[PDB]
Scaffold this active site. Sequence first.
Site, PDB file in Angstrom:
ATOM      1  N   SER A   1       0.385  -0.754  -0.521  1.00 42.01           N
ATOM      2  CA  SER A   1       0.416  -0.223  -0.314  1.00 42.01           C
ATOM      3  C   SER A   1       1.187   1.875   0.336  1.00 42.01           C
ATOM      4  O   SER A   1       1.723   1.350   0.139  1.00 42.01           O
ATOM      5  CB  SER A   1      -0.980   0.092   1.351  1.00 42.01           C
ATOM      6  OG  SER A   1      -1.441   0.833   1.073  1.00 42.01           O
ATOM      7  N   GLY A   2       0.414   2.214  -0.296  1.00 42.59           N
ATOM      8  CA  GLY A   2       0.980   3.399  -0.959  1.00 42.59           C
ATOM      9  C   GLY A   2       0.120   4.785  -0.947  1.00 42.59           C
ATOM     10  O   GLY A   2      -1.199   4.201  -1.420  1.00 42.59           O
ATOM     11  N   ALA A   3       0.836   5.699  -1.302  1.00 47.79           N
ATOM     12  CA  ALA A   3      -0.057   6.911  -1.845  1.00 47.79           C
ATOM     13  C   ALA A   3      -0.640   6.540  -3.630  1.00 47.79           C
ATOM     14  O   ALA A   3      -1.870   7.044  -3.175  1.00 47.79           O
ATOM     15  CB  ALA A   3       0.249   8.323  -1.845  1.00 47.79           C
ATOM     16  N   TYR A   4      -0.444   5.838  -3.681  1.00 42.64           N
ATOM     17  CA  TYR A   4      -0.704   5.654  -5.521  1.00 42.64           C
ATOM     18  C   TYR A   4      -1.254   4.430  -5.727  1.00 42.64           C
ATOM     19  O   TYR A   4      -2.402   4.876  -6.557  1.00 42.64           O
ATOM     20  CB  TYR A   4       1.117   5.150  -6.283  1.00 42.64           C
ATOM     21  N   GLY A   5      -1.658   4.162  -5.152  1.00 50.18           N
ATOM     22  CA  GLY A   5      -2.928   3.079  -4.144  1.00 50.18           C
ATOM     23  C   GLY A   5      -1.781   2.302  -3.519  1.00 50.18           C
ATOM     24  O   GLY A   5      -1.501   1.693  -2.820  1.00 50.18           O
ATOM     25  N   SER A   6      -2.814   0.737  -4.119  1.00 51.56           N
ATOM     26  CA  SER A   6      -2.404  -0.482  -2.640  1.00 51.56           C
ATOM     27  C   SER A   6      -2.510  -1.915  -4.074  1.00 51.56           C
ATOM     28  O   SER A   6      -3.454  -1.734  -4.907  1.00 51.56           O
ATOM     29  CB  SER A   6      -3.343  -0.652  -1.655  1.00 51.56           C
ATOM     30  OG  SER A   6      -4.528  -0.269  -2.095  1.00 51.56           O
TER      31      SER A   6
ATOM     32  N   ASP B   1       6.822  -2.624 -11.787  1.00 47.74           N
ATOM     33  CA  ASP B   1       7.408  -1.524 -10.618  1.00 47.74           C
ATOM     34  C   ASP B   1       6.131  -1.386  -9.322  1.00 47.74           C
ATOM     35  O   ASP B   1       5.546  -1.087  -9.579  1.00 47.74           O
ATOM     36  CB  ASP B   1       7.127  -0.187 -11.697  1.00 47.74           C
ATOM     37  CG  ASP B   1       7.853   0.886 -10.772  1.00 47.74           C
ATOM     38  OD1 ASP B   1       7.621   0.826  -9.869  1.00 47.74           O
ATOM     39  OD2 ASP B   1       8.638   1.576 -11.717  1.00 47.74           O
TER      40      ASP B   1
HETATM   41  C1  LIG Z   1       2.778   4.965 -12.441  1.00 45.24           C
HETATM   42  C2  LIG Z   1       3.241   3.718 -12.781  1.00 45.24           C
HETATM   43  C3  LIG Z   1       3.235   3.652 -14.145  1.00 45.24           C
HETATM   44  C4  LIG Z   1       4.312   2.429 -14.939  1.00 45.24           C
HETATM   45  C5  LIG Z   1       4.271   1.310 -13.653  1.00 45.24           C
HETATM   46  N1  LIG Z   1       4.604   0.057 -13.953  1.00 45.24           N
HETATM   47  N2  LIG Z   1       5.595  -0.033 -14.708  1.00 45.24           N
HETATM   48  C6  LIG Z   1       6.243  -1.191 -15.138  1.00 45.24           C
HETATM   49  C7  LIG Z   1       7.004  -1.688 -16.161  1.00 45.24           C
HETATM   50  C8  LIG Z   1       6.518  -2.230 -16.906  1.00 45.24           C
HETATM   51  C9  LIG Z   1       8.107  -3.222 -15.485  1.00 45.24           C
HETATM   52  C10 LIG Z   1       8.177  -0.618 -16.556  1.00 45.24           C
HETATM   53  C11 LIG Z   1       5.497  -2.535 -14.006  1.00 45.24           C
HETATM   54  C12 LIG Z   1       4.135  -0.788 -13.679  1.00 45.24           C
HETATM   55  N3  LIG Z   1       2.907  -1.365 -12.972  1.00 45.24           N
HETATM   56  C13 LIG Z   1       3.083  -2.280 -12.259  1.00 45.24           C
HETATM   57  O1  LIG Z   1       3.855  -3.180 -11.968  1.00 45.24           O
HETATM   58  N4  LIG Z   1       2.156  -2.414 -11.458  1.00 45.24           N
HETATM   59  C14 LIG Z   1       1.572  -3.345 -10.804  1.00 45.24           C
HETATM   60  C15 LIG Z   1       0.760  -3.476 -11.190  1.00 45.24           C
HETATM   61  C16 LIG Z   1      -0.627  -4.900 -10.262  1.00 45.24           C
HETATM   62  C17 LIG Z   1       0.206  -5.683  -8.873  1.00 45.24           C
HETATM   63  C18 LIG Z   1       2.167  -4.683  -9.258  1.00 45.24           C
HETATM   64  N5  LIG Z   1       2.268  -5.283  -8.247  1.00 45.24           N
HETATM   65  C19 LIG Z   1       2.800  -6.789  -8.209  1.00 45.24           C
HETATM   66  C20 LIG Z   1       2.325  -8.147  -8.492  1.00 45.24           C
HETATM   67  C21 LIG Z   1       2.617  -9.162  -8.567  1.00 45.24           C
HETATM   68  C22 LIG Z   1       3.958  -9.560  -7.021  1.00 45.24           C
HETATM   69  C23 LIG Z   1       4.473  -8.513  -6.511  1.00 45.24           C
HETATM   70  C24 LIG Z   1       3.493  -7.352  -6.443  1.00 45.24           C
HETATM   71  C25 LIG Z   1       4.805  -8.446  -5.280  1.00 45.24           C
HETATM   72  C26 LIG Z   1       5.140  -9.407  -5.006  1.00 45.24           C
HETATM   73  C27 LIG Z   1       4.846 -11.155  -4.433  1.00 45.24           C
HETATM   74  C28 LIG Z   1       4.735 -11.318  -5.791  1.00 45.24           C
HETATM   75  C29 LIG Z   1       4.724 -10.770  -6.674  1.00 45.24           C
HETATM   76  O2  LIG Z   1       4.192 -11.453  -8.294  1.00 45.24           O
HETATM   77  C30 LIG Z   1       1.959  -3.608  -9.790  1.00 45.24           C
HETATM   78  C31 LIG Z   1       4.181   1.657 -12.305  1.00 45.24           C
HETATM   79  C32 LIG Z   1       2.980   2.795 -11.564  1.00 45.24           C
END
Ligand SMILES: Cc1ccc(-n2nc(C(C)(C)C)cc2NC(=O)Nc2cccc(Nc3ccc4c(c3)CCCCC4=O)c2)cc1
Length: 331
Positions: free
Chosen positions: A28-33, A164
């Site tokens: 969780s954080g300011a941008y979302g969770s 990310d």
């Molecule tokens: C503003 C902004 C713009 C672009 C991006 N951005 N850029 C990228 C690139 C394409 C890498 C550059 C990718 C994102 N966005 C992104 O990754 N979003 C996202 C969405 C849903 C969930 C999650 N989180 C998780 C997913 C799976 C897991 C975990 C967290 C944590 C550990 C548990 C295992 C696990 O497997 C993250 C970010 C912010």
Amino acid sequence: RPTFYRQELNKTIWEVPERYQNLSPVGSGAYGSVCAAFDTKTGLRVAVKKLSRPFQSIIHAKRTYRELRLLKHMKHENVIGLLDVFTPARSLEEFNDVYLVTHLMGADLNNIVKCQKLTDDHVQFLIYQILRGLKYIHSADIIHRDLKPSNLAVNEDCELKILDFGLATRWYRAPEIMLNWMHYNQTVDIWSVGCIMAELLTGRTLFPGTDHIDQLKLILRLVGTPGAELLKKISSESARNYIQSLKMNFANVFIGANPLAVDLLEKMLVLDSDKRITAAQALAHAYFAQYHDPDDEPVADPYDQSFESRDLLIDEWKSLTYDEVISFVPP
Ligand SMILES: Cc1ccc(-n2nc(C(C)(C)C)cc2NC(=O)Nc2cccc(Nc3ccc4c(c3)CCCCC4=O)c2)cc1
Ligand SMILES: CCCCCCCCO[C@@H]1O[C@H](CO)[C@@H](O)[C@H](O)[C@H]1O
Ligand SMILES: CCCCCCCCO[C@@H]1O[C@H](CO)[C@@H](O)[C@H](O)[C@H]1O
């Protein structure tokens, strides 16, 4: 249209489709969770990111669109992909929440490393995948900028996805990013990879800086003061002077490492971002001979990033985002 159900999660109401079950907060954080969940429709474990106040401001709105656009574009097995995006909203007017659904691999790189030395074979496989992912990301003229173990999702088979998760932190950052340099090479991410790789090999953080300046001094200590070539690209005398208050043949840190790994680390951890190996070149490095397949290291379709240079109104970012949500087709 799926039927939604509501529950309270990370201090807000999450309204998600019923296929998504067992939602459990993982960040969780300011941008979302984000919640780990199980997609009973696909039988996949998924992470559902709910954007926080996605259209509150131009910045939130353009961020929301940025991420949606990026995730929709990423179609590579080493890069996090969008399995689903949904909104409870039934019209642009009521549109106020965006949820993004991705594979949940299960763990990040820290979880599987847990401060341990990994075997050379294992490091090969992991770094190979990162590099494969990065080649793809970079081919879309996208720079991660914040590659680090916590942004690397791995399943039990150590299959790896770059993501990310931003919603220690400083240790994998390319020095020029920390220095608000602004003209980033995609090899900012290569620096990070070198830092990650080094840590996988040694089990110890390469540059565990206590703060910004400490990070920089640790980097200078290892890779040495800027050479004449690099120095020529730094305009400020005073900055060059300041730097001079500070190579070192990559041996000591990486003792007992596969010489190929060290050779690659040496090509990654180059102060001059112009001289760092690229993801594609790194993939062809002998160190990955076991895994390298020049015909299975895909590049991305070209990625329309024109929006990045736009200053638009909230309404337009919202409407652009809404279009992307509606037009979303699952894999
Ligand atoms: C503003 C902004 C713009 C672009 C991006 N951005 N850029 C990228 C690139 C394409 C890498 C550059 C990718 C994102 N966005 C992104 O990754 N979003 C996202 C969405 C849903 C969930 C999650 N989180 C998780 C997913 C799976 C897991 C975990 C967290 C944590 C550990 C548990 C295992 C696990 O497997 C993250 C970010 C912010
Ligand atoms: C630790 C203090 C010195 C760090 C200097 C790192 C130099 C990074 O490398 C620099 O990256 C810039 C931004 O992409 C490029 O424009 C430069 O040409 C390149 O030399
Ligand atoms: C802590 C030691 C770091 C010294 C600061 C390094 C100076 C990098 O500073 C960068 O140099 C480039 C000039 O070529 C400019 O384009 C960038 O705007 C500037 O941020």
